[PDB]
Amino acid sequence: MVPHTLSTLKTADNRPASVYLKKDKPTLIKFWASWCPLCLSELGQTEKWAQDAKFSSANLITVASPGFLHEKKDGDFQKWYAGLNYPKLPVVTDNGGTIAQSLNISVYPSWALIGKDGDVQRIVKGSINEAQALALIRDPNADL
Numbered sequence: 001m002v003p004h005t006l007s008t009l010k011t012a013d014n015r016p017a018s019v020y021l022k023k024d025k026p027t028l029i030k031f032w033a034s035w036c037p038l039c040l041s042e043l044g045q046t047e048k049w050a051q052d053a054k055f056s057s058a059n060l061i062t063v064a065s066p067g068f069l070h071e072k073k074d075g076d077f078q079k080w081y082a083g084l085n086y087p088k089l090p091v092v093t094d095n096g097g098t099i100a101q102s103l104n105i106s107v108y109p110s111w112a113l114i115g116k117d118g119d120v121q122r123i124v125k126g127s128i129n130e131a132q133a134l135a136l137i138r139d140p141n142a143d144l
Contacts, residue, residue: 009093
């Protein structure tokens with residue numbers, strides 16, 4: 001109903017990741033890493049999806065884990081990600097992978113849909129495509 005913790009999270013733009021979410025629409029959390037080809041090369045893709053008019057029905061944002069798994073350390077990842085030409089890319093920082101570990105995300109990329117109520121909806125261990133996302137949201141039982 002009101003995940004205070006989810007809002008406590010911060011983005012790479014030193015802003016509240018909560019503002020990127022909506023308690024009236026389902027959000028989509030995608031975990032990635034600078035050491036991921038299928039992710040780094042998919043940066044732009046996600047940057048557009050979160051802006052896709054069709055995605056307006058379901059919020060879409062990513063999440064990074066600085067100092068976890070094999071990601072850069074805090075401070076650096078930000079200065080490095082700020083040069084990817086993606087100033088409009090929603091990325092929630094996780095000092096130590098708090099969210100990832102909480103959702104059991106060891107494989108990247110990854111996804112996680114959260115109903116408007118703020119409850120879990122689905123969790124995928126990979127990187128879906130355009131149309132894939134459309135159908136994934138259009139139906140509650142569309143892929144897991």
